[PDB]
């Protein structure tokens, strides 16, 4: 009922009336918790960008981090830090390029490391969360390079130093499974396992091909490192699930997010981050709407929820806004976050009933990516 701005006015008038002094100072953000959510604004390709740190429970912006051109954010699942890989130029968008990793303290937001990446190795692309990734121990950051050829850069966060590039095959995305291992997705339809030591050529093993060439896997799969679970939709809403918890890829039976009836009536996923996964509950969430087949990047107004073990539909929500990306908090009674690029607003829903609880507006120019920590 009483908004934040109103309770703040009441508290200030009371301090003033009672003579309570307080020293103006720099605040610290509250402790990271299950309901902290990060919204990154790539700003429709602008040279500088912003990340908003939000308390999902209150619907309050609790801090911000500035980034450069198309930065990739990461958030340690244990809450111990955040970091990004970013890119700046000597004269705004022209001149000498510097790519770099910053690590920030999650309560003061101060940089605790600034690690330059030599030879401008970052992939500059509309933001894909799994193009820059932390190892489960939080000690290493892995980032993708596309030019001149696919490679993965190894950054030692513990020792604050760039280490080396690992050359890889025609592969995309980085799903780390151990301090020294990650999977990627190949053009040919297989996954590749990349094992790497401190020195030497990495060991690279391919799985069987798991999808045909005419089945299109989206740029925004969900990956739960603590579950070892990769959830990968196609353009039609067919959902691939790969279990990586044994250290090797085990392909689960594919599930359909949409019915035969709905598909023949033009229901298809669409958006940016189209899929979310809740580990404790073992549940997939998918942004869908009725759309032409080549309108796959447009907003969707509905979310379907399905059991990951059986593929049964658990719920279908009318969101009430044009939603581009979703994610969930990883606690019990999770929040379902539904970011609208066009409204620049984060709508915060109860994930079980789909009901809208609160919203956070004025999130930059074209916000697109939601990130949460899995602290459980």
């Amino acid at each position: 009922q009483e908004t934040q701005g109103q309770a703040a006015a009441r508290a200030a008038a009371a301090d003033l009336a009672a003579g309570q002094d307080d020293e103006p100072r720099i605040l610290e953000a509250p402790a990271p918790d299950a309901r902290r959510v990060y919204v990154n604004d790539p700003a429709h390709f602008a040279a500088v960008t912003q990340q908003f740190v939000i308390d999902g429970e209150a619907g309050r912006v609790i801090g911000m981090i500035d980034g450069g051109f198309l930065p990739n954010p990461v958030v340690a699942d244990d809450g111990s830090f955040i970091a990004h890989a970013s890119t700046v130029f000597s004269r705004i968008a022209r001149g000498e390029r510097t790519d770099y990793v910053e690590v920030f303290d999650p309560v003061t937001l101060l940089p605790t490391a600034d690690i330059e990446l030599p030879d401008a190795p970052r992939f500059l692309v509309g933001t894909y969360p799994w193009m820059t990734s932390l190892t489960p121990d939080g000690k290493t950051l892995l980032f993708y390079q596309f030019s001149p050829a696919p490679a993965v850069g190894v950054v030692d966060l513990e020792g604050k130093a760039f280490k080396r590039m690992l050359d890889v095959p025609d592969c995309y995305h980085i799903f780390p499974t151990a301090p020294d291992t990650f999977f990627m997705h190949c053009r040919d339809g297989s996954l590749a396992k990349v094992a790497f030591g401190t020195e030497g050529t990495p060991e690279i093993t391919h799985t069987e091909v798991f999808h045909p060439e005419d089945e299109f896997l989206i740029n925004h799969p969900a990956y739960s490192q603590k579950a070892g679970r990769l959830v990968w939709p196609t353009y039609t809403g067919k959902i691939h699930q790969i279990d990586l918890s044994s250290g090797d890829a085990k392909f689960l039976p594919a599930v359909e997010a949409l019915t035969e009836a709905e598909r023949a009536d033009g229901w298809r996923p669409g958006g940016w981050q189209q899929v979310a996964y809740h580990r404790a509950l073992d549940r997939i969430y998918l942004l869908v709407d009725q759309r032409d087949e080549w309108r796959h990047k447009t907003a969707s107004r509905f979310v379907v929820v399905l059991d990951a073990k059986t593929g049964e539909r658990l719920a279908k929500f009318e969101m009430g806004h044009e939603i581009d990306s979703i994610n969930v908090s990883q606690d019990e009674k999770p929040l379902l976050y539904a970011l609208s690029t066009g409204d620049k607003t984060l709508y915060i829903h109860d994930a079980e009933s789909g009901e809208e609880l609160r919203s956070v507006n004025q999130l930059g120019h074209g916000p697109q990516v939601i990130t949460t920590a899995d602290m459980g």
Binding site: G5, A8, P24, I26, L27, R60, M64, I65, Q362
Partner: protein, 124 residues
Amino acid sequence: TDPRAKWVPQDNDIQACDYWRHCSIDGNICDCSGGSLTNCPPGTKLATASWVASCYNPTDGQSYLIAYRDCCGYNVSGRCPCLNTEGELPVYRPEFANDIIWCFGAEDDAMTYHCTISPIVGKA
């Protein structure tokens, strides 16, 4: 709102441009980017310089000197933009001028504008 109408303060919501202490704010209200009415957001640097206005409090009918301060060292927050100019004078009377980026004295020589806080320093 008619933007040319006389400004009308309130003392019930600090996130609105008509909040009484924001009578000469130019920029963004710090409370909307993770600070508070009189504290800066994490990661920013509190300037030591200020600008003053005399702002009428409709709560007690009294006018108070607000010595605004900037939180500096980040790009502009973009949330709760406001520009009010009650008693605001041109730049040759700078103690009352609000287009200047008043980030002087901020730690680490921070000079970029993020948001502004509104503490009271005295009664007019």
